[PDB]
Short mmCIF file of C-alpha atoms in Angstrom, two decimals:
data_model
loop_
_atom_site.label_atom_id
_atom_site.label_comp_id
_atom_site.label_asym_id
_atom_site.label_seq_id
_atom_site.Cartn_x
_atom_site.Cartn_y
_atom_site.Cartn_z
CA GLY C 29 -2.69 22.92 14.84
CA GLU C 30 -5.13 21.47 12.68
CA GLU C 31 -5.28 23.72 10.20
CA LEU C 32 -1.33 22.42 9.23
CA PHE C 33 -3.00 19.15 7.54
CA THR C 34 -5.49 20.96 5.55
CA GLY C 35 -4.30 19.55 2.53
CA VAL C 36 -1.64 17.52 1.04
CA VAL C 37 1.67 17.55 3.10
CA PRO C 38 5.36 16.50 2.09
CA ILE C 39 6.88 14.08 4.35
CA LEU C 40 10.72 13.50 5.19
CA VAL C 41 11.46 10.80 7.48
CA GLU C 42 14.77 9.62 9.26
CA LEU C 43 16.21 6.61 11.12
CA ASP C 44 19.74 6.07 13.06
CA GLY C 45 19.74 2.14 13.73
CA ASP C 46 22.00 0.37 16.03
CA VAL C 47 20.32 -3.39 16.41
CA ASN C 48 22.54 -6.21 18.36
CA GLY C 49 26.01 -3.46 17.16
CA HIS C 50 24.20 -4.01 13.57
CA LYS C 51 24.04 0.19 12.22
CA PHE C 52 21.98 0.99 9.77
CA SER C 53 20.24 3.98 8.87
CA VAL C 54 16.69 4.53 7.12
CA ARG C 55 15.12 7.97 4.74
CA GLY C 56 12.17 7.91 4.00
CA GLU C 57 10.48 10.67 1.67
CA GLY C 58 6.42 10.91 0.16
CA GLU C 59 3.52 12.54 1.85
CA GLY C 60 0.08 12.46 4.51
CA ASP C 61 -3.25 13.60 4.01
CA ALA C 62 -4.85 14.07 7.14
CA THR C 63 -8.50 14.55 5.54
CA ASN C 64 -8.04 10.90 4.79
CA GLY C 65 -5.91 9.55 7.04
CA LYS C 66 -3.63 8.36 4.09
CA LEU C 67 0.23 8.09 3.97
CA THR C 68 2.51 7.14 0.81
CA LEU C 69 6.22 6.65 1.33
CA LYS C 70 9.03 4.79 -0.07
CA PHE C 71 11.69 4.10 2.44
CA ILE C 72 15.53 3.28 1.92
CA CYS C 73 17.97 1.81 3.73
CA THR C 74 21.10 4.15 3.09
CA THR C 75 23.90 1.96 4.32
CA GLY C 76 23.31 -1.41 2.29
CA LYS C 77 21.03 -4.39 3.85
CA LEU C 78 18.46 -3.81 6.60
CA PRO C 79 19.47 -5.72 9.38
CA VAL C 80 16.18 -6.39 10.28
CA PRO C 81 12.58 -7.40 8.53
CA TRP C 82 10.99 -3.75 7.12
CA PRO C 83 7.53 -4.79 8.61
CA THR C 84 9.32 -4.58 12.27
CA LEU C 85 10.07 -0.87 11.44
CA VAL C 86 6.51 0.04 10.28
CA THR C 87 5.06 1.16 13.40
CA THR C 88 8.60 3.82 14.37
CA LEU C 89 8.86 4.95 10.60
CA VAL C 90 3.38 9.89 12.15
CA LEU C 91 0.37 10.01 13.60
CA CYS C 92 -0.93 13.47 13.17
CA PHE C 93 -1.63 11.86 9.64
CA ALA C 94 -4.60 9.86 11.34
CA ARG C 95 -8.23 11.16 10.20
CA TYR C 96 -9.89 12.38 13.32
CA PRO C 97 -13.31 13.01 12.55
CA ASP C 98 -15.40 16.57 13.84
CA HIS C 99 -16.88 14.84 16.44
CA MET C 100 -13.08 14.01 17.40
CA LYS C 101 -11.48 17.56 17.02
CA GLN C 102 -10.90 17.85 21.02
CA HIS C 103 -9.10 14.75 21.07
CA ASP C 104 -6.72 15.34 18.48
CA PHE C 105 -2.91 15.41 20.55
CA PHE C 106 -0.97 14.98 17.26
CA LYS C 107 -1.84 17.96 15.35
CA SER C 108 -2.52 20.17 18.09
CA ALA C 109 0.80 19.78 19.20
CA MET C 110 2.30 21.39 15.99
CA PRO C 111 4.05 23.29 14.50
CA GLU C 112 6.12 22.97 17.14
CA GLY C 113 6.02 18.67 17.28
CA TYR C 114 6.30 16.14 19.69
CA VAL C 115 8.60 13.08 21.26
CA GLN C 116 7.37 9.72 20.42
CA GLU C 117 9.47 6.91 22.78
CA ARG C 118 8.21 2.65 22.38
CA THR C 119 9.83 0.41 23.61
CA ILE C 120 9.29 -2.13 21.57
CA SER C 121 8.80 -6.64 23.32
CA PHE C 122 9.36 -9.20 20.09
CA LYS C 123 8.24 -11.85 21.95
CA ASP C 124 11.34 -14.59 22.54
CA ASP C 125 13.46 -12.06 21.22
CA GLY C 126 15.21 -9.09 21.39
CA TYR C 127 13.37 -5.16 21.80
CA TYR C 128 13.78 -1.97 20.42
CA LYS C 129 13.83 1.15 21.66
CA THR C 130 12.96 4.42 20.25
CA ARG C 131 12.81 8.09 20.41
CA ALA C 132 11.88 10.20 17.85
CA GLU C 133 11.16 13.66 16.97
CA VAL C 134 7.81 14.38 15.13
CA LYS C 135 7.52 18.19 13.86
CA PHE C 136 7.24 20.84 10.82
CA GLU C 137 10.50 21.51 9.55
CA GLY C 138 9.44 24.21 7.31
CA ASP C 139 7.05 22.87 4.27
CA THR C 140 7.56 18.98 5.11
CA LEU C 141 6.57 17.55 8.03
CA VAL C 142 10.14 15.06 9.83
CA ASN C 143 10.14 11.97 11.75
CA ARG C 144 13.76 12.15 13.09
CA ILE C 145 14.04 8.79 14.84
CA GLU C 146 17.22 7.32 17.06
CA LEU C 147 16.23 3.51 17.46
CA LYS C 148 18.46 0.10 19.90
CA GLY C 149 18.20 -3.37 19.80
CA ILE C 150 19.12 -5.93 22.39
CA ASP C 151 19.07 -8.82 23.18
CA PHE C 152 18.05 -10.26 19.90
CA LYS C 153 18.78 -13.52 18.33
CA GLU C 154 20.92 -13.99 15.45
CA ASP C 155 19.11 -16.76 14.62
CA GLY C 156 15.43 -15.87 15.21
CA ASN C 157 12.51 -14.58 13.30
CA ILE C 158 13.88 -10.57 13.18
CA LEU C 159 17.92 -10.93 12.61
CA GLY C 160 17.64 -13.92 10.84
CA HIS C 161 14.92 -12.69 8.24
CA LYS C 162 11.56 -15.04 9.00
CA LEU C 163 8.72 -12.55 8.35
CA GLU C 164 6.65 -12.18 5.53
CA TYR C 165 6.64 -8.75 4.03
CA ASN C 166 3.25 -7.57 4.36
CA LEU C 167 1.87 -6.10 8.08
CA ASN C 168 -1.63 -6.64 8.87
CA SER C 169 -4.61 -4.24 10.04
CA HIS C 170 -4.03 -3.47 13.97
CA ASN C 171 -5.80 -0.98 16.07
CA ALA C 172 -4.10 1.30 18.59
CA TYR C 173 -6.11 2.49 22.30
CA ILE C 174 -4.96 6.29 23.29
CA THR C 175 -5.06 7.82 26.45
CA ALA C 176 -4.22 10.93 28.14
CA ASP C 177 -0.40 11.05 30.09
CA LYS C 178 -1.80 13.70 32.24
CA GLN C 179 0.94 14.32 34.19
CA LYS C 180 3.38 14.96 31.05
CA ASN C 181 0.37 17.02 29.14
CA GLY C 182 0.84 14.22 26.42
CA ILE C 183 -0.52 10.76 25.56
CA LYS C 184 0.25 6.63 25.99
CA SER C 185 -0.77 3.86 24.22
CA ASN C 186 0.25 0.21 24.73
CA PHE C 187 -1.15 -2.39 21.74
CA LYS C 188 0.50 -5.24 20.40
CA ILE C 189 1.40 -6.72 16.88
CA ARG C 190 1.65 -9.65 15.19
CA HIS C 191 3.90 -10.31 12.66
CA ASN C 192 3.09 -13.08 10.18
CA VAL C 193 5.81 -15.52 10.25
CA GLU C 194 7.25 -17.45 6.74
CA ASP C 195 6.22 -20.91 8.78
CA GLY C 196 3.02 -19.91 9.36
CA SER C 197 3.05 -18.83 12.85
CA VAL C 198 2.97 -15.74 14.96
CA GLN C 199 5.46 -13.21 16.15
CA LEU C 200 4.47 -10.80 18.26
CA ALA C 201 6.06 -6.89 19.30
CA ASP C 202 4.51 -5.79 22.86
CA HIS C 203 4.23 -1.80 22.06
CA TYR C 204 4.55 0.98 25.02
CA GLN C 205 4.03 4.22 23.78
CA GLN C 206 4.54 7.42 25.07
CA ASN C 207 4.18 11.13 23.80
CA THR C 208 5.44 14.57 24.97
CA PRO C 209 4.62 18.16 23.34
CA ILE C 210 8.12 19.67 22.53
CA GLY C 211 6.34 23.64 22.36
CA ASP C 212 4.07 25.14 25.78
CA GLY C 213 1.13 26.39 23.78
CA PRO C 214 -1.97 24.58 24.15
CA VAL C 215 -1.97 21.22 23.46
CA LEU C 216 -5.45 18.39 22.99
CA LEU C 217 -5.40 16.06 26.18
CA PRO C 218 -7.83 12.93 25.09
CA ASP C 219 -10.56 11.31 25.72
CA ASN C 220 -9.37 7.12 25.49
CA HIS C 221 -10.23 6.66 22.20
CA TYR C 222 -8.49 3.76 19.19
CA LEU C 223 -6.50 4.47 16.15
CA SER C 224 -7.33 2.05 13.78
CA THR C 225 -4.57 1.11 10.50
CA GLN C 226 -3.63 -0.96 7.20
CA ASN C 227 -1.22 -1.30 5.84
CA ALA C 228 -0.05 -2.46 2.10
CA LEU C 229 4.12 -3.01 1.58
CA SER C 230 5.12 -3.08 -2.26
CA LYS C 231 8.43 -3.33 -4.00
CA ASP C 232 10.00 -0.26 -6.71
CA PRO C 233 11.05 -2.71 -9.20
CA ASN C 234 13.15 -0.69 -10.65
CA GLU C 235 15.00 0.13 -6.96
CA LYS C 236 17.86 -1.97 -7.04
CA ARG C 237 18.19 -0.85 -2.77
CA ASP C 238 16.87 -2.19 -0.26
CA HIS C 239 13.60 -0.69 0.58
CA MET C 240 10.15 -0.78 0.85
CA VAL C 241 6.90 1.17 -0.69
CA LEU C 242 4.23 2.08 1.62
CA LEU C 243 1.03 2.84 2.02
CA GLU C 244 -0.97 3.67 4.84
CA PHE C 245 -4.49 4.49 6.12
CA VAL C 246 -5.07 5.64 9.83
CA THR C 247 -8.42 6.15 11.19
CA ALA C 248 -9.24 7.24 14.60
CA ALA C 249 -12.43 6.66 16.32
CA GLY C 250 -13.89 4.85 19.74
CA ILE C 251 -16.06 8.74 20.59
#
């Protein structure tokens, strides 16, 4: 599957969301460059205003674009599943608040790498940090430890995201993640390793819609 990522690849992201009954849609477009681990994307909320903070959706909104160094080539599950793709599911628990459950398919649709997501959020506090929009517009660097999920022929990961709250506190989001191939062909079940991710979030001054401009770098290491 690796050959599909030798150059720059266009990306489409589509998210259908429902958080405490608040329905919303997000569409993202841009490109990814797996040789350097770089993602360049712009996300728009196509239904109006996002009812949750943009940084809480970053992890949900394409790990096949991570830079796997050559000594780790037999450990890149994400590209090995391509072009058929993989399912990515998560439960994301916000400390002292509600939780997200997400199910996505990540696969090639012709020339474009497409991440199509369903998100549900349950048990949030309308005046809490998420539905109350109390999180800074940034996302700090994080490491995610990837382990083989042998029974499912896929991978799993759990990691905590630390969201900066405008009052100086931190809001934890505990991620549990499972990935399963869509195809039947040979995929690469990795040794334990980790992905390192950093993000820059910005705004397009010519964009009057609620939106997020995102730059992301994801690099694999640990073996």
